[model samples]
Target: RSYPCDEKKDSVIAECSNRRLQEVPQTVGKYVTELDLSDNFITHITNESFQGLQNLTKINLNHNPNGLNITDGAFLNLKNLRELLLEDNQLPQIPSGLPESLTELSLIQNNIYNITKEGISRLINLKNLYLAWNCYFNKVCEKTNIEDGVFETLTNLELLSLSFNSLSHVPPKLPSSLRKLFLSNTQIKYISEEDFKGLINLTLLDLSGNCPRCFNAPFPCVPCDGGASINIDRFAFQNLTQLRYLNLSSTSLRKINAAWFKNMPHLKVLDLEFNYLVGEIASGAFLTMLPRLEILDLSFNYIKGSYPQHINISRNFSKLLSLRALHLRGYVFQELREDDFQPLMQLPNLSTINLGINFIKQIDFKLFQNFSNLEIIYLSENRISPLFEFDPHSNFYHFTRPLIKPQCAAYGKALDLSLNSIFFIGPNQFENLPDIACLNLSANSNAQVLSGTEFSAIPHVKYLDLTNNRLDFDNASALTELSDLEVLDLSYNSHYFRIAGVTHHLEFIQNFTNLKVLNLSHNNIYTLTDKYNLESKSLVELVFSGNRLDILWNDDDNRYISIFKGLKNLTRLDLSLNRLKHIPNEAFLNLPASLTELHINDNMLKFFNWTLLQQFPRLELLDLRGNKLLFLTDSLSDFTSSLRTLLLSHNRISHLPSGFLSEVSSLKHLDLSSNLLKTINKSALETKTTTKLSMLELHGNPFECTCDIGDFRRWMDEHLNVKIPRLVDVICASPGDQRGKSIVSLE
Candidate 1:
């Protein structure tokens, strides 16, 4: 039988993806305008193929492993075709007889190596062409052999991609009408002045991964072969006056010189990241030439300095009047003086700055007071001082403390101080910035305390992250003042409860009535006692994974029922990695009716009754990976109608019932990987009822791969909508010679 086709607004769309068909479906309607035949094993296309598809406008034939052998007149009848995609194939040359009406063509990741003038001379109307990644055997071909006048014929081309090829030089005489060109991952080592002489209308150019001297060196340094330096012409890009975006990242350039960009007057964005830029930059190096430049990225370099003293940004950047954004991340700067950013004060448009992943120890209070238009600052992954002062005479926990109040002059919307060593936050530490709305202090392993008045200055802040800190239940009461907060993440803190307590910490969170998501995972919390009251109606998702929650299941007091009584609006809950062996019949008696997703994976669960899922009628996704489940009964059908995603991978299930999924009308994604299933029951996959199943994961199972399982392999190869992620990795376990061979290969 032919695959099914669907009707759209005014056209018919037929899908035949990954069907292992040897040829195009003969029964496809002649009126179909769109056809998808990707991920198949089709090997040839004769002249008579697609002879009657006069209305076809789009055809996708990508990911065909055996490549396509198209005859000279294979596409002579496709006069109306506009888009053709043939990527990931083995075609040795550009196919002939393409429609003259074609506008976009992609041949990426193919084995073709030559581009002659006659091959594409007739494609004058083409606007976008992609021919990237044509290399073979992990090595660039000795040559790509592009004829002199090959690309000049396509005068209307606007975008061209020649990345990941074996060309050692830019193809001479490109179409001057091109606006965007991608040449990354080629073997080009040098560019003289004549390389881009005629490309005057170019606006964007990507030349990354083309340096030969620094092919495999670490960032910031592409060591020259034989310790010789690679030279670049100063005016190589002088003709590209209209260029607005230029990427030279990871090119192994050693320094930045003003002459390199002196010709491109309209350049707005220059990326020099991952280069060997060290030493001092000449005064006014960039400001003197590119006055209108808006964005500059010099990240991931080996520039070593203490700000204001060693770095000469104050003198060099004073003339950058139009500069708007600057990225200096991943440098080795250790400190910032008060006048380090004095030159940035002249830039009226400066708004965003990033100094992350450095060794910064301190920042002078008014270091950033000059950028009046600053809106966001990222200072994460630094080595800031902890708030407390260490005293050898005092005990470990009772160290002498100093009240350091960091001042912020700019009223930015967000600030990230994560992965620092800050241990304390004093009252009203951020009082100067009233407009701050998001604050990230995660991974500050020493931040042990927080006072209620610490955040009094930024009352409007809506997002706060305190993950991987040293917070305990005693310090949580300080968060009650964040009444306007919408999202709070306190996961992976140092909070543990070995004995039952008053549970006041849970009651304190109710004060933030605007909170929509709360994450409290990995805190070693044993149980949710009835003594606590959680009436946060705005909360929609709650995460409590990686805790000691097995005790709650064994408690005879039925605390779980009363503990979740007030969360009527909860939609998602996660209780994974809790060592739960089994759930009691009444364990979730008071679960919210609005719950639609549940995660109970990485536990010791052995068996579960379908009655447990009856409480949440709206549940659409259930994750039970890494459990000890052995068998399933017909009771699962009770919620199959509403369930959309079911993940049961990494279990011990050996077999499924005959009609396991016969009633799962809404099932779309099912994962059964890494299980003990030797074979599946054919009746369980009733095609008429489980028509919605689109993703099926069955890898890591032991399949016989013999005639006894031939029907199963046939069904997998014929399914129209179901997608097996690791289909090619499903190996055989029987018949000694075929033991390690993949089942797909056996076919």
Candidate 2:
């Protein structure tokens, strides 16, 4: 089988399945259309391999062994080929001269490199291309040195991902047909308006992890361009009519005018996470002219000043009934007035909101009247501390608390008042909010749980987050009144009780048989599983992270198995940050078959044996991160088909067993962060079959981070599917010279 075949011109079918082959034959003849050489042991393919296969259309060489390499001009003869797939191959370079007629190509995980110009220019009609995880293309130039017209040949390309590249600047003059352009982790500093000239049809653009410095020495004063334009050192976004998603995270932008994005009528998501955005936004920072703007992310920024005085939400843009998510971070102001959100009341379609890192000590219920369409409201990281006693003359009184209309409770809104100094929640505190689905009273050191009868006024409370509160059942009986309570969090309340050895609050939990989500994390309660034997049918998710349970089986009913039995309907369980030596075989006997996500990270477990979880049928996500396991059990390979995500980070595992993850065909996300591994076992990672595996989170380990780790780093650089976001904060802890350096090799 030498020459390529042309599918559109003539029909020639070829199948080479599971052949222990080494190289792709260079067949001459331009009539061949389809060729399949899957599950083989082919090694390398040269330009002469497919000599005369000028008309080859479809080529499938998946599931093959041996390191494969395709030299330049390997497909020079296949001019009429349409689809080409060479996935699951161990290639290390981008094959040159792809068939000119190729419209779809898939070469995932082939270790391709620097084909930005030579390789991509082969197929003039190529439309769908998948070249993820070829880190050889990323190169961080000390100075801007990307060749012009890097993307000129892909004029008709729709989706392009150069996300993991180490390039310092964006490839200039992209095509107009591009819908998704992923350029994350690049060292891009400057972006002229010309960079986005032909990208008017772009829908999603990810520009995260770029080192955007402070454009101005004294924070230079940039004038607004007027009419909804974001002014940033003359860099303006223009002519983007259908642009929807834009992520500019970790760019270190200090200040921005509202007019940066002008004429983007369809812009929906604008992310600015992890930046030092400061100063007050001009009144119309987010234009009311944008009728389709939905999600606006301003999180992880260092914003200052009080809520702007002249915020106007009353405009034709308010008619955009689709605006839903809004995130505002670093808003550490001292006060917010009713006038600040007067125009927001005009928005009848807002739903989720994140207002963390603010200093709002008070809020009037009257101002919240227009947010009847709201659902989730986050008031965390603020100063919503409750007063021991209501002082009529205090500044708190200046803020509104009384609900204007009790009927607003019908909207099922969830309120988050966490991380405050609140000491008490009066019985009448939520008299107006009778239908709240989720109420977060966490991190309030002074708040005590209310009496059971105290919450009788409310009708439909589902999730109650009381973690990190200074509460005890003895003094506060208000929690007993929550009849419809489903999710209750009592974590971080070790000092909640006065007694030393008392256990079991059966009377409290038994009242609500419908409880689903229960979080007892970071608590000192020694015997809830011992006495109650939590076998609630309706219980779903249990978070007991950071507890004092050292062993799995205890004499008391508090044994881990007993607790599992109690939550017969549990689906997700987080037992991380504990002190468990080993998982007993019987520990999972009582676990529900429906359990999907389990987090046992940050524990003292020494080994991971599949026999412990063999009985559970539907288990999918297993997180064993931060454990003391020296080596993963060899038998753990048996879970290859059932497991979806596996996390073995922060463990002492030195070596991975052969076929460790071979059986887990359904595994999608894998995390091996913070381990003692000096080298990765590529043979153990090889798969005999195709799976949905996409994400691999590896960081915080004692990785050499040198050329030895470069292969994996390069693998991560090219595989856009890998979960690299979680690896952002992971830095080298050893080799003091690289203490703070990122494993991904940041410049």
Candidate 3:
């Protein structure tokens, strides 16, 4: 507690960060009012550093490795300073008496180059100013160095993160009381309409990575401007009517000027993500003057011209009507006309309609007449060839499989036909989506859920992703009505079938008593925990990772048991990549004392039993990551009292016993990163009276900085940075003049 910093309990808050402190630490008096001092190495900051800290109000001094020289009355005694971060830091300017009732000033990355109006015209009550990466990596910022009244005396500026700078335009005046204007990755190029003429309360406008039209996409775009895109003069943004979020992501626009959205109309989220945009867009072009639009990140945007692509959206989204999410992931429409959303069903406040990277063979669902307020319809990556459009001369449900509106069925929730070309899901083909609930037909490779009666036309299917597919169950019978199938990802799926030895079949998990999170990772199944057994009384997570289970007891039914018979309210169990090397405390009777998260990662598990961890006292996150696990039975015991995240990275545990983390007295996040440690012994990480160990990842190990690892390298520089967060990956593999350096600057 010798002031490296900590004091929030009574909330005098003084977290003296990083603590290599080259200065600034009047030991924070006058009832500290927030004073972080980020990553310290402080390079000069005089003015008697806050005389009697007049009850300061926030001062992080972000990332200062050696580049902050703030000596202009240093902070005029932080006079009720209202936030001043100083991000990344190198500082080329803007450090003059900041408090005029300072309101939030970040100075991102700082290599300022120039923003000189005699230092931000003196904060003038700055409302929030972030000055992004000052011209890429801090240097040449000359495009007239933003000298137009440097924010005209910040008239109480309202949010201005001048994005990765080198300003090409639009930073000349900027202070009509701005309202969030992050001129994204800059080099502004050109934009007219007197560039936001009279701010009039701008409301969040990001102009993402400036100008980029670059063709068909194979990556790399920030092109256009002489070769087009980003010209924009056509009434530019027509007086931004209090816009509500407008990010022109990757602004390489080829064409989209419909009078710059006719005075925003209180636009609501409109990012033409990664742009090129074409195929079509005409209802007065700019989405019918954004009548209160709601989320339209026109996804991917390679829409130039090609196979059947289009976005007329029946006359451009037919007057937005408060649209609710319309992404369009990749305009691969090869055909989708049921009146192509008949003007987006005149917006009943639609919700999510992304045509996800398509080619589209078939998936009509009679394109909506109405479904209350549609939920999701992203035709996941298409190749899609399983439609019944058969013809013995029409009417097999009128022109093959019709339900234009068979007296209402779809309530709409999730319908991501995973990776298209569905191998089969015929019967009542979604009999009109009965309140579908997450049905991602995952890969579609070994597909075939033979959904004959189609799960009774969808019994609110809960989160079902057929991961790698390969699980063709003959469910011309899905008995006991899916019991609201909750979370089911048949991971990797495990191929090798044909005459394959034991290939998945708990009669396909029949009569589900309420399924819950079940991912059969890699699925080879050989004696899976004593040969197949999954009865779920309400399974709560179980991804039997990489299976081929090494005996854990079993019964062919009616008598003996153990593969965790009938879960009991199982609480998370992932037998990570198995073939267990040892573990038989009757493999912990049959688990479930309401278990709590467990993953025996990459098993070869020699042993680590305190009677196999007292059968989990509500254990919590114990992934023995890649188990080469060397030691563990040292009755230094006190075991599981709700352990907290412990992944022994790679593992070969050089040493650990001394009350290894106070025997899980609620241990805190500890990943032994890559293992084979040459030295670590700080009593194997003591902690108990604990919040002790926010996160302690011993980066790639082998840390031997001599002097017998200097008392665990000064017990890890007194644990700052929440127990070694990438402390330079704690390198220095051994002597030879500290081979890789940094064991907290080895003596």
Best by lDDT: 1
Which of the two candidates, 1 or 3, achieves a greater lDDT against the reference?
1
Rank list by lDDT: 1, 3, 2
Sorting all predicted structures by TM-score, with the top scorer first, yields 1, 2, 3
**For each candidate, what is the lDDT?**
0.71, 0.61, 0.67
lDDT of 3 by residue, 1-747 (tens): 224455563447777788577788676757888888898898777778767787888889788874778888678666778888988777878787666778888887767767777777776887888877666523554543777677878888898877767677886667789988887667686877787878878888877767655455333334555645566677766677887898776676656766677777777887877666644343336776677888787666654555564444546676788888777766666677666667777677876777777677766675643534776766778777666112212211112231111111132376777787666666645665537766677787745654425567677676677777776543424334666676677787666322244333454454566677677788665532223556767778788777666643322332224666567788888887777775556655566678778788888876756555666778778787886678655552455567778787887877766656445556678788788777866666564432355777877787778787876666656665455555545677887788766576746
| TM-score leader | 1
Error of 2 at 390 (Å): 47
Q: Which run of 10 residues does model 3 get worst, by summed lDDT?
A: 389-398
Name model 2 segments beyond 4 Å from true: 1-116, 128-146, 161-173, 182-200, 204-238, 246-263, 271-280, 299-321, 387-412, 446-449, 453-459, 468-470, 475-478, 496-504, 516-522, 527-747
Q: Compose the digit string of candidate 1's lDDT tens values, residues 85-166.
A: 8887777898886778888888887777998766677888888888887862244454688899799989999888887677
Candidate 3 has an lDDT of 0.67
Score every model by TM-score.
0.75, 0.55, 0.36
In candidate 2, residue 704 scores what lDDT?
Answer: 53
